Swiss-Prot record:
<comment type="similarity">
    <text>Belongs to the TRAFAC class TrmE-Era-EngA-EngB-Septin-like GTPase superfamily. FeoB GTPase (TC 9.A.8) family.</text>
</comment>
<feature type="domain" description="FeoB-type G">
    <location>
        <begin position="2"/>
        <end position="164"/>
    </location>
</feature>
<feature type="binding site">
    <location>
        <begin position="51"/>
        <end position="54"/>
    </location>
    <ligand>
        <name>GTP 3</name>
    </ligand>
</feature>
<feature type="binding site">
    <location>
        <begin position="144"/>
        <end position="146"/>
    </location>
    <ligand>
        <name>GTP</name>
    </ligand>
</feature>
<feature type="topological domain" description="Cytoplasmic">
    <location>
        <begin position="1"/>
        <end position="255"/>
    </location>
</feature>
<comment type="subunit">
    <text>The isolated N-terminal domain (residues 1-274) forms trimers.</text>
</comment>
<feature type="binding site">
    <location>
        <begin position="9"/>
        <end position="16"/>
    </location>
    <ligand>
        <name>GTP 1</name>
    </ligand>
</feature>
<comment type="function">
    <text>Transporter of a GTP-driven Fe(2+) uptake system, probably couples GTP-binding to channel opening and Fe(2+) uptake. A guanine nucleotide-binding protein (G proteins) in which the guanine nucleotide binding site alternates between an active, GTP-bound state and an inactive, GDP-bound state. This protein has fast intrinsic GDP release, mediated by the G5 loop (about residues 149-158). Presumably GTP hydrolysis leads to conformational changes and channel closing.</text>
</comment>
<feature type="region of interest" description="NFeoB, GTPase protein domain, binds GTP but not ATP">
    <location>
        <begin position="1"/>
        <end position="255"/>
    </location>
</feature>
<feature type="binding site">
    <location>
        <begin position="115"/>
        <end position="118"/>
    </location>
    <ligand>
        <name>GTP</name>
    </ligand>
</feature>
<protein>
    <recommendedName>
        <fullName>Fe(2+) transporter FeoB</fullName>
    </recommendedName>
</protein>
Length: 255
């Protein structure tokens, strides 16, 4: 059974190194129409690993997006990957989980690969693996460097992979969910309900680039925002703050 896996993480998360270790000399360097692609095997699977450009987020709310960011986003939303391996820097967890949260809100099958365990230890940081997994609703695999043990556990997890656990991640105010869902109902229904509801939130948060994916929902954004502004100060801020609360709450328990 062949699997297509996207490798995604922040810049300087050790992603290039992990890609190289996983694929060895079974790799091929193309471009996105630089696009690195490689092969490896697990017990059950022949995996095609696709290296996505380093990025801190699938989008940018307050400022201009980058090319790398748009490439990652488009690939992720295309649904070409059967699952993703989200490489996370254990020494800068809070910053790294911003991207992770987006992947999980999108409902994309995910395996977190906790990297840079050494540097975390030398920064006096210990991550509670099962605490994080429980809260994210996906596997969390410590990438132990010694004798490539982390790689072997990562391959094990790929063979074990099922859907993410359907867990509440962010706790949004009810008017936000309502408005996002009603926007979602009008978006191109070729997109899954979960992603259309996320796009909805992104629109409400001021994400300009999400409007490209939302089609006819953009015609209803103004009316949704006016309503929300009559029951809370600034809907975009309530979205960002809830997301900050979620990630901060996780980090306090987990780190």
């Amino acid at each position: 059974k062949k699997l297509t896996i996207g490798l995604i993480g922040n810049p300087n998360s050790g992603k290039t190194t992990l890609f190289n270790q996983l694929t060895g000399s079974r790799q091929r360097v193309g471009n996105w129409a630089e696009r690195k692609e490689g092969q490896f095997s697990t017990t059950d699977h022949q995996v095609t690993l696709v290296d996505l450009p380093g990025t801190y987020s699938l989008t940018t709310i307050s400022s201009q997006t980058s090319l790398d960011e748009q490439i990652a986003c488009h690939y992720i939303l295309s649904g070409d990957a059967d699952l993703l391996i989200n490489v996370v820097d254990a020494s800068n967890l809070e910053r790294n989980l911003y991207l992770t949260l987006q992947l999980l809100e999108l409902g994309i099958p995910c395996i977190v690969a906790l990297n840079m365990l050494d540097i975390a230890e030398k920064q006096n940081i210990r991550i509670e693996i099962d605490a994080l997994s429980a809260r994210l609703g996906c596997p969390v695999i410590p990438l132990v460097a010694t004798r490539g043990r982390g790689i072997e556990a990562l391959k094990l997890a790929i063979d074990r992979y099922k859907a993410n656990e359907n867990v509440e991640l962010v706790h949004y105010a009810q008017p936000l969910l309502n408005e996002a869902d009603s926007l979602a109902k009008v978006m191109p229904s070729d997109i899954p309900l979960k992603q259309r509801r996320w796009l909805g939130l992104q629109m409400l948060e001021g994400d300009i680039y999400s409007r490209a994916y939302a089609g006819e929902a953009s015609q209803h954004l103004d009316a949704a925002l006016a309503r929300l502004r009559n029951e809370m100060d600034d809907p975009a801020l309530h979205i960002a703050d809830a997301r900050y609360q979620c990630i901060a709450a996780i980090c306090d328990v987990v780190s």
